[PDB]
Amino acid sequence: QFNPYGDNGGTILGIAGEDFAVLAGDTRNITDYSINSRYEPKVFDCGDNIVMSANGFAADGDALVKRFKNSVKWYHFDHNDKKLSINSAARNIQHLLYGKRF
Amino acid sequence: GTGYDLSNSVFSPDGRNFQVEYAVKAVENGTTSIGIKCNDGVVFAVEKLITSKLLVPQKNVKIQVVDRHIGCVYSGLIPDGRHLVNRGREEAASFKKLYKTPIPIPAFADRLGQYVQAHTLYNSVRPFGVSTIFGGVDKNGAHLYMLEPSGSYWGYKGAATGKGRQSAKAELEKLVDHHPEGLSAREAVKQAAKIIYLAHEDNKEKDFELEISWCSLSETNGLHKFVKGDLLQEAIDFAQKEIN
Amino acid sequence: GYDRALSIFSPDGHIFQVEYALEAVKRGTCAVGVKGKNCVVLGCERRSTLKLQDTRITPSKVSKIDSHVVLSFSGLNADSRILIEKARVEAQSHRLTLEDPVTVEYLTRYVAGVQQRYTQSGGVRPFGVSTLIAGFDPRDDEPKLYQTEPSGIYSSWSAQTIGRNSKTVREFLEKNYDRKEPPATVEECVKLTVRSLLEVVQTGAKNIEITVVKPDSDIVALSSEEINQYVTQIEQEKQEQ
Amino acid sequence: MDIILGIRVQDSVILASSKAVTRGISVLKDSDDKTRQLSPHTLMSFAGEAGDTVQFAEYIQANIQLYSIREDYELSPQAVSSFVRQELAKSIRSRRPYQVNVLIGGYDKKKNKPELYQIDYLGTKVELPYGAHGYSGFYTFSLLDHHYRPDMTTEEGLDLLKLCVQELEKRMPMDFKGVIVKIVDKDGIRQVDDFQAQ
Amino acid sequence: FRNNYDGDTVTFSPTGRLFQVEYALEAIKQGSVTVGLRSNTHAVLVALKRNADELSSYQKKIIKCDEHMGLSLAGLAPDARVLSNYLRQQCNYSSLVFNRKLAVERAGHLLCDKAQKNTQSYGGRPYGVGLLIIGYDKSGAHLLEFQPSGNVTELYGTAIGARSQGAKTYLERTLDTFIKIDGNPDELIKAGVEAISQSLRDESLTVDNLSIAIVGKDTPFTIYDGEAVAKYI
Amino acid sequence: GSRRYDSRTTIFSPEGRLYQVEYALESISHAGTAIGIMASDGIVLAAERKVTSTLLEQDTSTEKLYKLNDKIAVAVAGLTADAEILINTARIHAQNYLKTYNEDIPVEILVRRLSDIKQGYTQHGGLRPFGVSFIYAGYDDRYGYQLYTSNPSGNYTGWKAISVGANTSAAQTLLQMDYKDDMKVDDAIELALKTLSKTTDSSALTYDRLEFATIRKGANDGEVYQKIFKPQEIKDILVKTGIT
Amino acid sequence: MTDRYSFSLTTFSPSGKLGQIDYALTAVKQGVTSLGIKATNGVVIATEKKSSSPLAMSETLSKVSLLTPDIGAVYSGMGPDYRVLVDKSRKVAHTSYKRIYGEYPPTKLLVSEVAKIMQEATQSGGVRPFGVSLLIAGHDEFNGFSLYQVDPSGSYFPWKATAIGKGSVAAKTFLEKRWNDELELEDAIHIALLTLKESVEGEFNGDTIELAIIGDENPDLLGYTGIPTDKGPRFRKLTSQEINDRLEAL
Amino acid sequence: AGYDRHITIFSPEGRLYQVEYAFKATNQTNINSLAVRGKDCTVVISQKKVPDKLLDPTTVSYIFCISRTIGMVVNGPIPDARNAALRAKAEAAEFRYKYGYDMPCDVLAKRMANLSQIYTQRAYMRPLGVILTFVSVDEELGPSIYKTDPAGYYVGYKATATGPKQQEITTNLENHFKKSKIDHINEESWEKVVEFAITHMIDALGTEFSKNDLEVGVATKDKFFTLSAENIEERLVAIAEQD
Amino acid sequence: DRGVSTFSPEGRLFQVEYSLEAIKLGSTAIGIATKEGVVLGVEKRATSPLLESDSIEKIVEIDRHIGCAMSGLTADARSMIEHARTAAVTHNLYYDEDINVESLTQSVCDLALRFGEGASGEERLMSRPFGVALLIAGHDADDGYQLFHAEPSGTFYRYNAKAIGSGSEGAQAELLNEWHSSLTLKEAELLVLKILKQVMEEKLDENNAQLSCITKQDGFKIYDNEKTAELIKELKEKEAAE
Fold first, then answer.
1. Chain H contacts of G55, Cβ < 8 Å?
2. Which residues cross the membrane (chain C)?
3. Which CATH superfamily, name and number, covers H1-243?
4. DSSP letter (8 states) at residue H127
5. Active-site residue, selected from the candidate residues B31, B132, B161, B220
6. Which among H113, H123, H157 is the nearest to G80, CB-wise?
7. What is the dihedral of CA E86, E88, E92, E95, to 10 degrees?
8. Ramachandran angles phi, psi of C113, nearest 5°
9. Would you list the DSSP string of E9-54?
10. Pairing relation of β-strands D125-127 and D130-133?
């Protein structure tokens, strides 16, 4: 039968400093025992000083990041270019994710 | 009594649909446009009034393509024209999807015909404020058509509509008489540029811009294409020369 | 399918269908409500265009929405049924989800909302009805009396009246009701109510019904005699002068 | 399952319902009242699926109260049970059926007679002298088939139930934490607060 | 006459006119003036913000639709919000689905068609606002004029609103000049402010009264208001 | 558009009255008169057949008295066809109730439901109201014998004696004059006939122009019995009461 | 598009009249006469085949239609309205009755269904009433023979005999004179022909008159044999020849 | 009140003006047509008028091939005529699919007549300003002619004519049949039936025809087709060698 | 008749203009914004001495940081308030923050033109425009204290001070002269009370008039009668002082 999910591997890491923060991730993308790419960015700058990575099933990670970036875009459109604070982005991501709870 | 002209699908005591007739007025009040059927294709030309120097030249294109082998030009309310072409495009895409082959001109004409006639069946809609000239090449030749706001259409040897339709028609009739054998795509392009120029006298007040397009089995391979650069100027001159 | 805008603005800024809805209320039998210190009384008049009715079964004017709240009205009878049913349903729904019966203001705010909605929805005319809603909030002893009208507007009153000749009877109440000392008794409250109705009912022992509402779902309607007795004592207060 | 019992004597219907509410390995509550009053003279007990149970009871209660207010009248026990049966019968063929069994005990003020109705989640209704839902019936039907009498007084009915509860507390595998007993008669519904040792 | 044929947008007059559309166009004329002009590297929008009282604000007239597109409105503000929102979505769709920035010419066609639908059907009403669209795409700087009739035109410059005719003649004159203001934004803006002031009469463009927007070669569509426009008054 | 042809059947007049309801009532006032009289041991329903002919089949006819239940019946005054639409839905509502509670439907619940349906055509939908007025005669174990009346507005009331249709004013005055709380079915039967007899717009009151029905609780049984009199039966009761 | 006519086109006027229904009746009045007579052992319905041109084949146009094997209908007024009504009647007899009880509906109930359809065209949104009056004759086991009239309002009434259309007033008067409760089917057919003659201007023969009856079962018109309980339809249209034979005895 | 003339509701006289005005539109094309039945064929003749010189004569027609067996000639404005033709085709194709056999000429006619009756009763639909004449050689009925109008009326004919000068053609045909005493052209070939048709079209209209003034459609067992200018010229020649 | 969304020959929507006329007949409402908060005051205008004036709610809370005052067909305002409350609460659920005052206002105004009998643009099911205008006041981090005027036309203007209702033309004139960038909350209060007193037919007291304010510190609060009574007394005194 058809399985809508796949596993693209990869590992990501985020550490927060007193006045800085880092989000890292290897650039390897895999499927089973083969390498799809040795360099396929997985950590993105989404604007408003926010970096994000959705790791696991890459198609889902890309759709999410893409949807969030667009979210930031509209946040500006609907709230007089206000900056989206990290805490607000987090809650926003929660709704994006829970929107596909099933 | 009266008031038979206030609602779209109403028959007047003499069997007419006055709203369609008023739609025609909007068409006659529009820019002039024509179509000329040649021995293996069709040519489309239209007058583009230069409202002011501010209009970026060559940018506000009026002739529209449907699928890849059909050209459409119209006179009247431009937005209504676009609306009709969008429908034609959906209509052509649907035909190709089911039958594989791109839609035949006659078949396409009726698709636009039925849609336009449909807008004269209810008072919840307004008739189309444009007469449309369109055509192209298909499995068996070239075909030229003109569709009125009533949904009426026929195949033509030559056709014109808009402010200077009479001048144009007069010119087209001459061509028809002096060329029983058939004009050529190359010739038709020039002849079209001339007629647009002649027919521009009924609006000689405002300056204009010429626009031509054609679809010829030999000159364009059966694909609709716009006339640009050298071939365009060469036609513009041929007109400017016979306008004196 | 039908969605014609029936209630719309006119040049002067009026919505005639709502305005004419009020005219249907003015034409309805009179209804009055006065709140005592420990109760609220609702009185209604009984038309006499045709008399030969079966009082047992003929639908009464005061309606219980829940065991602690009642609703009376003036206007189209058929319309009032619709509002009463929706009120009764909302009352049960509220008990079901909030696990507590509705307050009188809540129930009023709901009826009013339904009325307002029918003033700006397509395909429907406003309710030709005005209501008086009274009762006691759960576990409360402070009396409640509210009034709603076709537009959807509502508010509470120490005493109010609606319907034909409500102008007359309101005058009576405005110069007979003291907020300083509200009818401290069920009796003197019912009396002030009957007096107000007599100003317009023109001798009608069978043309005046009354319902007394006390705290904790204590609601009862007076019989002809009980009422007729009040009328009697009233006509004497006059003659004894 | 939970224990839901009912017995109709001479002038009343008595309902006994276990107090335990257990989930998995834990008895979460031991004072649960598995009953809802539908009208001053009609009581309904219920057992079944975790959430469906109360949602159904309260939904029925809401409807009966609505009818009472609208009609300023109290539906007869037979009328209410037919309404409940239809609801269940609709439910059994719906997307997600109500998995609830009920006992409806009511005192018909017009006939001046107590009535006990047993209805399962399929909408199967029957009127009985005594009834039970769940495994309980397996020990109580024959017990009552032996000790029950038509003309019994309310007091005799309570002693009869006590005999039932004792049998259940002896042979049933689960600890249902006793029962709450309610009497439905011409004067309404009252709860026997003293059954923990009657 | 007219009175019998201007009841709704689904009725043609005996001469082939659509009065409801024409009345909508009238809302534009009653609107505050706004101007647009472009060179080969930039496109600028200059708009006069109108205020109710001296205690009220000067209603914004410029809406950003995407990093490369934006517009100015004249007439019913709400209708501009609707149309610009539709434009924001079309720009968005183009990027998300095709990873392509929407061509200003296409944006114009889309708007034309959206407005056209409210002029042939019963129950609806034409939009009552005019729009000037500027943008930089894969073919340079662009300026479009949108009319509620559904007519959209590409120009080097233009103006709409009350007394717009002044600024328009000025641009039709200054043409050969500003069309060459390439690589110099400040000049294009100044040339715009000069065109707009050609429609003044009431007062003079102040700081919280003037609104400017620009987009170009290496300039994402950005809006300047207040202190930001001071250096142009 | 369509708006042009919409009568707006559900709007208020400046006086707060509903046009269509008022006009429907006016229609009803020209309908054959129907009378209802409630006694201690039963109820009587009588109606005058508006318009008749020698060839009209009276044995197979019924235009005014309909059975809704075994305990409820109605007398009609207005459009027969409209009445039939309502009567049928009333019959269904009665059976739904019976299936739900396993008890016959209380008279008022059924009357209220029907009145509510009518009320709707008054507030939404844009349709004309039903041109009908009903007199309901029924029995239930909560109120015993009951008599109700409903009209186009959806309003309903209870009565001891009532009339609908033509000359109700005259009919009511006569009824309010001879009715007495302790009447008996037979007394009522006679009162009903006398009243119709004095209000008829016809020469005489013959049996072929009447429909009669009674709802009694036959002493020799204990249940309620409805009896829609047959032609002959009416002819009889007509002579007995002294109208021959 | 989309029918936006969701309001009634028939409404009450200040006088209480329902205009559209009144007008529909006026259309019925201009229609060709048609009548129906009930005998003790049958019913006959007839009308004139008013051919609109000698080039037209009057047989390809039936004003008398079979609804069920024991029920027939004829009319006066707008022919097209009748045609669609017949289609709908034939179908409602199946959907609302035969497919449920496995037997055709009794005359009164099918008439009731038709009447309902007509009443709805009197109240539903966006329509006008049907411009016709029908005469439906039929037979069913528990009711025997019957004749009904259905008007544009949806109202219907049982008749011993009657006429509708053009000269209905005169025709009815003539029927009241000749009708009695002992008429045999042939007698009614005869009286029917006499009545129809007064309404016909030109030719009066089996080719200009359309007449059918509801009488005994016609096993010969069943189409098969082998089932005792199935004896055939009671509805039978008379042939041109059968009509002429009776005209000579006029 | 005065709107009982804009939509299809009754007038105080029980008339439907919109239907009457629709009938008026059927003559807007000033063309006449007629149909006759042969021994085993059916012929429809219609004047063909092409005034504009800029028109492609081959695309001007009022005869349509609805199905392999049914032909339809229309009297009325072309747009409504094409609306009617498309519907009839769809209806004929669907019938064959659902019922397994070719839709009969009379059934298609009844179907289109019913559709027309509806525009006559529902207010939002206008009647079509056309009269449709259907022809074929039905497998059960033989040569057939069924015509439908804006009233929803339809009937079968022995022969029929339609248009401004319908009456003249009608009486001409009527006289011929009063004479022949039979209800059809007793000819074995359709060519001769077509000749009879055109001959009487000339007598009745008092006009001569060239090969481009007519339009002919013929129906035979299992097929309906239209003639070419040349097939007609050959017909015109034949009739000329008789007069 | 004529569509509910028809343009006049002057380019105006009949229904919206007529809507504005109804708002003119409404009770007066005044709002004043200061760097110390925004004050909202309204004329109760009871129609009979038997009406319990405190049951007149013309000033309502949208959220802790946003308040609202209405004028015109007040029953029409309920769905607007409900929409606003829901928008404010919803925004906080989606973003873990407060909705900006302008954003809240813009949302309320999006409902405005959603009326008609089938306008080709979405599904505007509402037979007529609202017959009430609103004064929306609040505070947010980015733009501080704000006052907006939302009309049935869908347009909303920001004001330093604004008056709507029967006495608006008069009261607006007053506000023009009295308002200045450095008013204190107290001054604004007395100023609202004063102007209401001038336009009101009735003699202003703590029972036929009501005040309220929104401060960043304590949010939206409706002054109880006792508190306003003192402010009234304090006004009478300062007026009589010269």
1. 157-160, 170, 173-174, 177
2. none
3. Aminohydrolase, N-terminal nucleophile (Ntn) domain (3.60.20.10)
4. P
5. B31
6. H113
7. 120
8. -60, -40
9. TT---TTS--HHHHHHHHHHHTSPPEEEEE-SSEEEEEEE--BSSS
10. unpaired
Experimental resolution (Å): 2.5
Please say whether the beta carbons of C185 and C170 come within 8 A: no
Q: Are H93 and H137 in contact, with CB atoms under 8 Å apart?
A: no
Distances (CA, A) of I10 to A9, I13, I17: 66, 9, 11
DSSP 8-state assignment for residue G125: B
Neighbours of B33 (CB within 10 A): 33
CA distances from F218 to F185, F215, F227 (A): 11, 9, 11
User: For residue C214, what are its two tokens?
Assistant: 């006390």
CA atoms within 13 A on the CB side of D111: 15
Q: Per DSSP, which regions of chain D are E strands? A: 4-8, 12-18, 21-23, 26-29, 35-39, 42-48, 100-108, 113-119, 125-127, 130-133, 179-185, 188-192
3-state secondary structure C117-148: HCCCCCCECCCCEEEEEEECCCCCCCCEEEEE
Tokens of B95: 């035909």
C:17-76 residues touching chain D, CB 8 A cutoff: 64-67
From chain E, pick out residues whose CB is under 8 angstroms from the CB of F5.
none
Contact criterion met (CB < 8 Å) for F102 and D78: yes
- Burial class from Cβ neighbours inside 10 Å (0-12, 13-18, 19+) for residue I130 reads buried
Per the structure block, which two tokens stand in for G85? 């009504």
Give the CATH fold of the E1-233 domain. Glutamine Phosphoribosylpyrophosphate, subunit 1, domain 1 (3.60.20)
Distance CA D18, CA D2 (A): 6
Cβ contact (<8 Å) for F108 and C6?
A: no
Residue G2: CB atoms within 10 Å: 12
Is F103 in Cβ contact with D71 (below 8 Å)? Answer: no
User: d(Cα D100, Cα D123) in Å, to the nearest integer?
Assistant: 10
**Which residues of chain I neighbour A85 with C-beta distances below 8 Å?**
97
- Which method resolved this structure? X-ray
- Domain extent for G144: 1-250
Amino acid at G49: K
- DSSP-derived secondary structure letter, G95: I
D57 at interface of F, judged by CB pairs closer than 8 A = no
- Which chain D residues touch C95 with a CB distance below 8 Å? 62, 65
- When the candidates are 3.30.565.10, 3.30.1360.120, 3.40.630.10, 3.60.20.10, the CATH number that belongs to I1-242 is 3.60.20.10
The architecture (CATH level 2) of B1-244 comes to: 4-Layer Sandwich (3.60)
CATH number at residue G9: 3.60.20.10
Q: Number of structural domains, chain G?
A: 1
CB contact under 8 A, I22 and C158: no
Domain boundaries defined on chain E: 1-233
Q: Testing the interface with B: which of H20, H26, H54 to mutate, by most B Cβ within 10 A?
A: H54
Question: Measured in whole angstroms, how far is the alpha carbon of residue E58 from the centre of its chain?
Answer: 17
- Ranges of each domain in chain H: 1-243
Selection from F68, F91, F65 nearest residue F228 by Cα: F65
Q: Give the whole-angstrom CA distance, residue C114 versus residue F33.
A: 39
Residues preceding gaps in chain C (C to N > 2.5 Å): none
Chain-chain contact of B155 with H55 (C-beta, under 8 angstroms): yes
